[PDB]
Symmetry: D2
Subunit: 267 residues, 4 copies
């Protein structure tokens, strides 16, 4: 229905719990054709299953740490989607972040290192600019959009978020800059700031479970959001319904970012 005959490149699918899986899901449900990318061979398995679940046009390798990797990915994409009068792409989904585990443990000042910061910014922030660069002509040809996933750590302190907070502030700046750079070609650029999501994996970590729990206690809706809530918001922003929207950070966080002190917290 809504995305009939529209084409999307989705990155960052690591598994069934990935927000990007849910994004892929929402897009497929609405009639879209997908190419999915994978960073390495060990993650390739989970991507293939997504390929299966959603009838993926193609599954292409893409390490956003490698400009060469990105270039060849977009070359491959050109051959499915860059030939004919109907050439182009309707969206690119960036759902990639990484910081060395040791950057995110305890005191920001003690834990943050020159290299970890460099890596965090490269993979989490520059990579979006990199995909914008490689996708420009295809997106331009269908006036399609770019979408990234961010987080409130950028503008508000949360413990152990650390250098990812810096990397996300950076990525949100890139949203604004790209929207200015690309809007002349009718390409929209947007971000969703997802709330903390209770996953299987995440619930594993005492400190993470704790953060999830104060979240629910602060958030107006008195819960954490689900992946599907984020996927449907993403669906919206990638859809013709969002044609008037560029440069937006859309919070899908059950209202967390708007509270200073909740009544529930007062004890």
């Amino acid at each position: 229905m809504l995305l009939k005959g529209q084409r999307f490149v989705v990155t960052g699918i690591a598994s069934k719990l990935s927000i990007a899986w849910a994004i892929a899901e929402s897009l497929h449900r609405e009639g879209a054709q997908l190419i999915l990318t994978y960073p390495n061979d060990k993650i390739k398995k989970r991507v293939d299953m997504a390929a299966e679940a959603f009838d993926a046009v193609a599954v292409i390798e893409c390490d956003v740490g490698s400009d060469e990797s990105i270039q060849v990915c977009f070359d491959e994409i050109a051959k499915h989607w860059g030939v004919g009068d109907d050439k182009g792409i309707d969206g690119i989904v960036h759902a990639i972040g990484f910081a060395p585990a040791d950057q995110l443990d305890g005191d920001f000042t003690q834990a943050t290192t020159r290299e970890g910061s460099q890596i965090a910014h490269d993979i989490s922030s520059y990579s979006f600019v990199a995909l914008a660069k490689a996708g420009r002509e295809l997106l331009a040809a269908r006036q399609g959009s770019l979408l990234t996933l961010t987080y409130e750590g950028s503008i508000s302190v949360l413990p152990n978020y650390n250098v990812m907070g810096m990397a996300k502030a950076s990525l949100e700046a890139s949203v604004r800059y790209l929207a200015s750079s690309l809007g002349g070609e009718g390409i929209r650029v947007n971000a969703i700031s997802a709330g903390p999501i209770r996953t299987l994996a995440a619930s594993g970590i005492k400190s993470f479970r704790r953060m999830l729990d104060v979240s629910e206690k602060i958030a107006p809706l008195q819960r954490n959001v689900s992946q599907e809530e984020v996927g449907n918001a993403a669906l919206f922003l990638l859809s013709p319904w969002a044609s008037g929207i560029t440069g937006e950070i859309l919070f899908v966080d059950a209202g967390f970012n708007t509270v200073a002190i909740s009544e529930k917290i007062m004890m």
Copy 2:
């Protein structure tokens, strides 16, 4: 399809050019049942035509300047929508603003008066709280949402916007407060900040046309948004797709709010 069997109260329809008409339109298109309200008898005509175009369950009077007017409106609504096991309302749309014309002419300090400010805040800002108050039980019964329309004048100066800027900052605060007050009942509260819209009427005013033109010159997409772009974004926020979103200000302004100085402006 998307809003099949869902019920919405839409205010602020003054004519075919009204953003609220386009909102009503988007909601109907997706299968929704509408009650439309009108402030006075002279505006009633335009509302009726909307009633016609969209098969309105009902057309009820509602002056958001009168608590009594609002109460009786919601009494009337109770009789269509507050009986049965399926009782309740899926959304309320607030698309009402007013300031005395003389508040909005030239120097903010010279032009702003105690009474005009009072009127601007009452009709433009308190009225949303007022509808929240009267709608609480119906919204609560279907976990539905509230939606208002705002503008960037709240946080950024634009000439002659004046006391509406203050009134809109207020209204956006009310979005945050209501989201906190109501979220425990599963009621979402959100706002769209629309960009300047080129209408027939508006194009009439030299000073307005001028503001429209610098807008297009600043905005990344190099245009002003259409009512339908705002109606579809509203559709989204009122829909189950937006179930993870409360407290949001969603800009539908073709990216204006994100620019400081455009390259086009540099001359």
Copy 3:
């Protein structure tokens, strides 16, 4: 020293605990001449003592609820400060807020009334515009500045803050508008957003003491600010040192506004 021969009008002194007392204090310490205003006869006593402590040029009545009251106040001020070649005023301090007590108790939606909102906006927000209006010519003559006191409730929910949150968002909009309206005459307009202050009175209220305590627990400096911290920041903004600053909201809140979830809160 720093404010030798400079003249300030200070409002909002209700007692020794008032932030405005501390502001007056900082200004006097640095060599400034003060006129202090009082709203009513019962508050006049505390103002007089301030007059005593700081060698006030004059003590004039000023109910910011009355345009007539404000006009005559500025007439009186004209006679001390509006004659000679050295005519004018270096600053006006607005430290006035009020909402009916019943507006600020429990559920925002249940508690907020049309009239309380109206009163909150009138006294807390419009009054600053009103003083700007009456002071324009005097400020213009010495290129002096306006300063108001706000609070984070405007942009972030805190319980029972309610309609003052709306009133403060409004007042901060007025800061931006006034800065635009008045800057052509070299008049600066700024605000301080004070953190919660532990006073004698305030510590009286269980709910207030509780809010103070979560504050200290969230704030980076692990304490609440003192009146004197706010008075010295105010001193700065009213001083020639702040000649490049207009339109600013300066947070003096020991860093509260920047935290989402503190480590101390995590239990």
Copy 4:
């Protein structure tokens, strides 16, 4: 007077036009002892002259691109300022930014490269964290503060600012994180967002002069700020007067950041 017997480490002095020169100046004027740092041997000359003008305790090398360079700098500083019962430092001033010239020319997407972004973030953003790290114990011992210089490009697009916009969003995130990490030791962390400054050098570049000119046209005070305005604001934030302030971005930009469309711009 105000900073009698207080000690500051100032970085980023490149010449007499440097904002950091003006900062040094303001600090000295108020009775402070300075150590100044230099990045390389060719810049060392301008630093020495500052050493002369302000009676610098010491002039130490510090390339914020080298962790080793930073460590040894703080070792040297320890020997002047880390011995005795009065050991410690009252402030550290970070006034360092760099991006490869080619990152800042034309289309953000075309011009931005993986390496330029990496370099911009390393020198402009991580370096502040690096100084925080090395200075922690000295600052802790006198409960002193850190101060950085930023710019509105972080949150609002300006042409050719590009990857520095991203780097500055990052640096402002670091301000928030550091304020949280360090506040327990009574160390404040703040930033000034300076407006565009008309310098000799800068006026040289057609595109820069143009940006300066639209600035003056947009800014409420109808001018650009001077270095001395920034130095005095810095003086304030480094002073005991600012003891209640941490995590702040203080705009010293003559009100630019608050305008959307000026009346002067409307043509």
